[PDB]
Amino acid sequence: IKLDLPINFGPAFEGESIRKGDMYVEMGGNRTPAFELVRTVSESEITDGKIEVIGPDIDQIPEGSKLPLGILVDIYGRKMQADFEGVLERRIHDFINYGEGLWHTGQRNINWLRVSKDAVAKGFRFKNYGEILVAKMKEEFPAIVDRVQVTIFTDEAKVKEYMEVAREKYKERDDRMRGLTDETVDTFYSCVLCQSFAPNHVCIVTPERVGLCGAVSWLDAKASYEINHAGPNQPIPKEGEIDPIKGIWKSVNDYLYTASNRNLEQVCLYTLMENPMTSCGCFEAIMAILPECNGIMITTRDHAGMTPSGMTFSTLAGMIGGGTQTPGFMGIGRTYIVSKKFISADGGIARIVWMPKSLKDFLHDEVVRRSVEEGLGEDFIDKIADETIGTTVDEILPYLEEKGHPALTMDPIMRSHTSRGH
Numbered sequence: 001i002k003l004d005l006p007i008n009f010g011p012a013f014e015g016e017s018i019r020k021g022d023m024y025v026e027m028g029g030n031r032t033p034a035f036e037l038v039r040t041v042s043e044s045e046i047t048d049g050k051i052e053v054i055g056p057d058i059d060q061i062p063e064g065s066k067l068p069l070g071i072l073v074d075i076y077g078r079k080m081q082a083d084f085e086g087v088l089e090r091r092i093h094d095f096i097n098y099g100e101g102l103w104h105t106g107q108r109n110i111n112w113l114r115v116s117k118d119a120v121a122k123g124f125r126f127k128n129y130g131e132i133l134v135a136k137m138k139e140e141f142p143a144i145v146d147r148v149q150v151t152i153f154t155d156e157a158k159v160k161e162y163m164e165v166a167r168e169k170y171k172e173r174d175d176r177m178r179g180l181t182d183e184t185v186d187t188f189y190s191c192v193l194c195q196s197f198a199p200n201h202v203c204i205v206t207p208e209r210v211g212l213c214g215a216v217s218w219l220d221a222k223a224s225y226e227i228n229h230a231g232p233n234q235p236i237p238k239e240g241e242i243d244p245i246k247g248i249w250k251s252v253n254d255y256l257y258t259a260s261n262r263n264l265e266q267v268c269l270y271t272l273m274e275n276p277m278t279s280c281g282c283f284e285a286i287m288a289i290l291p292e293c294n295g296i297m298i299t300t301r302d303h304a305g306m307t308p309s310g311m312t313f314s315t316l317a318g319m320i321g322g323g324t325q326t327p328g329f330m331g332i333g334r335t336y337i338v339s340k341k342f343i344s345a346d347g348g349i350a351r352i353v354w355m356p357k358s359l360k361d362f363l364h365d366e367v368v369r370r371s372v373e374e375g376l377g378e379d380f381i382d383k384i385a386d387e388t389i390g391t392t393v394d395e396i397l398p399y400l401e402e403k404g405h406p407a408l409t410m411d412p413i414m415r416s417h418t419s420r421g422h
């Protein structure tokens, strides 16, 4: 339908970024609680086109301030399913990034948004989030979406409340993923949704490796392909298995070559050290090699602090970004860290020597579960250094020594390291 924003809106603005100095509001990114959700609802419980804002609006908050956020998108459609919810929810990301002076990254309840001083000057107000979502949902998913309603929560209480509604739907999606492993499926999925940001980037999504945005599970990719054969996701048959440990299939290599416009020739699903997966612009975390540690550090998009690699998330994002292949450096989704297949060819989670404490917190129970499953002890999470120990190799290494971090005494990871050239 019709969309009449006071701000430009379209593909050309998607890659915009908004510096703190230009920011009018910010919500999410661990600065305030924030979530987004897409729900199948029945038709009698939905008003098509209705957008409400519950809580303070853009003109009722100091400039440069923070706000908690709940984006709730109720969909009704004759053909609509629960299985599809994760597919539409992903699109909230570019839908918003199309608006000039609107910025969004992350997923679920670690999403992050900013609105620019200019967008506000021009007229933007929270209602417009709703208008964009209503228009675009309808436009992109014609066969699936008959009716759309949007609620934008900015009241502290209501976000806390609807967070639970979301948490519940989230857990429910993850349950569908429980049974499925890489060995026990015969199809993987390619994703190219982000080639607007990196023209040659392709994600290869398997049941044990979520998309680097952490918002496209194997099931999501599958659902997407069923929703639209000409869509951003394609099926890749597992065939021509070259290396079971590294994770190289002749057929994955084949579809990767085509999808990356003859740019990438091989990818290894289970290693960081040779033909690793490339990155677009929305990865949640970056893994970087730490040669002196015989290990790997991780830092996250929303973590501003120094890291023992000597650079911050941004500076790291700088090198690994753009669909180029970078041995020793990889962009990943948060929950990948706790996959069984997490860099399994390099010794798995045992290699992680440093992480932001927030990440540890977010993944706590899984880390502990996986720890036990590889005989690293339940106390393994506490042997991984974080910023409260130090940000430099000089600080963290004696800690690793003292705590007896397993990485220190494994095989030289650096021998694993195949250059990208020749």
Ligand code: SF4
Binding pocket: 191, 192, 193, 194, 195, 202, 203, 205, 210, 211, 212, 213, 214, 215, 216, 280, 282, 283
């Ligand atoms: S990060 Fe990867 S899986 Fe997620 S939307 Fe992008 S290309 Fe797809």
Ligand SMILES: [S]
Binding pocket: 194, 197, 280, 281, 282, 283
């Ligand atoms: S991206």
Ligand SMILES: [Zn+2]
Binding pocket: 194, 197, 213, 280, 281, 282, 283
């Ligand atoms: Zn992306």
